[PDB]
């Protein structure tokens, strides 16, 4: 982002301008829709707008009942999914979140017992917003929505009297497809994904009920201001569970993430093979420490794979369920004289292949066996030819790099790039410490 520093000593790059936010825990939220006594009244006079929608609502209720009854069947002491519908349904939630689906499900078992939902309904009798405590000390924020029940009951049964249906209106029929949209989409999502939706949508929680349910958590005044502006990524990392249909209401829960850390410097380290130690003797080194890094409490957290973290410009949305704690002396491998303080793992072996590693600001390229690799752009097709490798090139100097008729694009972001002068590694590198470069 802000500054990239090139290191000839080990052929690596570091970008040091990323403020970060790390997830810490989950905040739950229990809803309760209303559909009312739609199952009782019947429409049996001509096919028209009202007739074709009542059957839709009743069929949706039937499908929701079937999928809720089938939801308490998959929980056969299952913890490791071994089915196509479940393995492919658990990877879209995030591998690091697979340990969070279990926590949500275990919370679901507590709240679907008797005398638990009874408390929730009692807590919502007079108001649509009432925080309630569970039996095991956990606090649950309960939200109630009553759009249909205040439409099916008070100003629908009058119109449909004596089963002389569909005749005495042409406008209320249009409104019956207005209040009915949310419930149909909710049941469709839950029946399509077996009750475990992959992310919140504007059907589970509208934009009004997300800003109100994020300013009711107990948090600082900065973690709230950050969420009320990153509510897109908040929606992207929270999943909703299904509790069931208890009579004529739909109860489900939705898990909102909590950002425990809001500002702390972070950096990316990216590497590629080192050198032609001796022309024909291609025995050169390779850092295997790439990934992310962030500070939380004076102990840097390390994510070995870059897919575990995202980016929204400066802010970095990592998580603390897959982080690996490293000593805060790990930043000393960037000034490499083969220091014995922190043993850098790096690697060992003699099979160097030409590689390209895309950097946030520039790009780094290595060509060893004499492959025709050339710097390219848009205004000029071929600008210059480079020799050997580890020649880091900016994204202002070049716009594409070509290696074995395979082009790579470069980013347009701008930052104060830096280069650290240093001699590359020599023929013999013994004092480098001991990694495990296998598997």
């Amino acid at each position, epitope marked *: 982002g802000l500054k990239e520093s090139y290191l000839e000593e080990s052929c690596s790059t570091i970008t040091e301008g990323y*403020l970060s936010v790390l997830r*810490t825990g989950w905040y739950t939220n229990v809803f309760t829709l209303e559909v009312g006594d739609v199952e009782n009244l019947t429409c049996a006079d001509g096919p028209s707008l009202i007739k074709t929608e009542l059957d839709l609502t009743k069929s949706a209720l039937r499908e929701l009942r079937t999928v809720s009854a089938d939801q308490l069947a998959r929980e056969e002491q299952i913890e490791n999914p071994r089915r196509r519908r479940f393995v492919l349904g658990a990877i879209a939630l995030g591998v690091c979140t697979a340990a969070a689906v279990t926590a949500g499900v275990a919370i679901a078992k507590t709240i679907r017992l008797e005398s638990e939902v009874t408390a929730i309904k009692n807590a919502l009798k007079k108001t649509n917003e009432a925080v309630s405590t569970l039996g095991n000390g956990v*606090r649950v924020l309960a939200t109630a929505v009553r759009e249909l029940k205040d439409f099916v009951s008070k100003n629908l049964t009058r119109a449909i009297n004596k089963n002389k249906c569909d005749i005495p209106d042409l406008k209320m029929a249009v409104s019956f497809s207005q209040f009915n949209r949310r419930f149909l989409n909710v049941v469709r999502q839950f029946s399509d994904n077996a009750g475990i939706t992959p992310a919140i949508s504007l059907d589970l929680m509208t934009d009004a009920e997300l800003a109100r349910a994020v300013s009711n958590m*107990p948090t600082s*005044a*900065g973690q709230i201001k950050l969420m009320l502006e990153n509510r897109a990524m908040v929606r992207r990392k929270g999943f909703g569970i299904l509790i069931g249909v208890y009579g004529s209401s739909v109860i489900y829960m939705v898990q909102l993430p*909590i950002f425990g850390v809001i500002d*702390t*410097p972070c950096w990316i380290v990216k590497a590629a093979p080192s050198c032609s130690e001796k022309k024909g003797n291609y025995a050169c080194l390779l850092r295997e420490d790439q990934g992310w890094y962030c500070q939380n409490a*004076g102990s840097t957290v390390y994510y070995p794979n870059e897919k575990d973290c995202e980016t929204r410009g400066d802010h970095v949305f990592c998580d603390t369920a897959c982080g690996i704690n490293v000593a805060e002396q790990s930043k000393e491998c960037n000034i490499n004289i083969s220091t014995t303080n922190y043993p850098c793992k790096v690697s060992t072996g003699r099979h160097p292949i030409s590689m390209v590693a895309l950097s946030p600001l520039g790009a780094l390229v290595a060509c060893y066996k004499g492959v025709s690799c050339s710097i390219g752009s848009n205004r000029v097709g071929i600008i210059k030819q480079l020799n050997k490798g580890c020649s880091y090139i900016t994204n202002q100097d070049a716009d594409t790099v070509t290696i074995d008729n395979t082009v790579y694009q470069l980013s347009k972001v701008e930052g104060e790039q830096h280069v650290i002068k240093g001699r590359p590694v020599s023929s013999s590198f013994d004092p480098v410490k001991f990694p495990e470069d296998q598997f």
Partner: antibody, heavy 122, light 111 residues
């Protein structure tokens, strides 16, 4: 080993200015939010300011809003508290306290500094 | 919103039990936010006594215990000595006032 030293206290006329500092030592300064807590002579403690770990979100108390300004220097290990238009009801003792939190609902100032005194009289 | 209220002074006798209360309101302790206790000696800076409403940082001599429930918190000092004469403040978090401090009570031993 954590040790917070503040300096800059003195006597200043009403409607003046004064810049209090605080130097940290023994821990990573660029990872902790830091506060400024003041205590009138013989009264209870009161919170004054706060700045996150990278000078992004800054919160001021209600009575000092529009007159103070907190800053940081993550490389020189200090945080500063500019004052302006001081009044006679401002004299107090200022502490710089590191910030501790558990993540969700617990917030406390654990390693308080030493403290400096600011006298403001005509 | 509202401020945290504490009794002015508390008197005790050696070897007895002392209870210090910290009464909150509906916006700071009613929203599940902590109560934190600081002991200020007559000449020094405050030091942490209890964090998280029940825990103890290393150094506190195991005779200080706390409890929070609803909109109140309490501190219990078992076997009061002659060296525990100080001021005790209770700290929370309020929704609209970012950090609220209590008035502060002073424990006086009658030996």
């Amino acid at each position: 080993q954590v040790q917070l030293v503040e300096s800059g206290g003195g006597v200043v006329k009403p409607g003046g200015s004064l810049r209090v500092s605080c130097v940290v030592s023994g821990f990573t300064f660029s990872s902790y939010r830091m506060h400024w807590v003041r205590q009138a002579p013989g009264k209870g403690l009161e919170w004054v300011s706060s700045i996150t770990a990278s000078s992004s979100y800054i919160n001021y108390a209600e009575s000092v809003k529009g007159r103070f300004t907190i800053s940081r220097d993550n490389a020189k290990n200090s945080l500063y508290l500019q004052m302006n238009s001081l009044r006679a009801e401002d004299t107090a003792v200022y502490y710089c306290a590191r910030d501790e939190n558990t993540g969700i609902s617990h917030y406390w100032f654990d390693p308080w500094g030493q403290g400096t005194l600011v006298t403001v009289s005509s | 919103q509202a401020v945290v209220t504490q009794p002015p002074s508390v008197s005790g006798a050696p070897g007895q039990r002392v209870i210090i209360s910290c009464t909150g309101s509906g916006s700071n302790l009613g929203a599940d936010y902590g109560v934190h206790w600081y002991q200020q000696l007559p000449g020094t800076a405050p030091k942490l006594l209890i964090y998280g409403d029940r825990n103890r940082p290393s150094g506190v001599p195991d005779r200080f215990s706390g409890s929070k429930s609803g909109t109140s918190a309490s501190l219990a000092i078992t076997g009061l000595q002659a060296e525990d004469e100080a001021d005790y403040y209770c700290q929370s978090y309020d929704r609209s006032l970012n950090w609220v401090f209590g008035g502060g009570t002073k424990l006086t031993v009658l030996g």
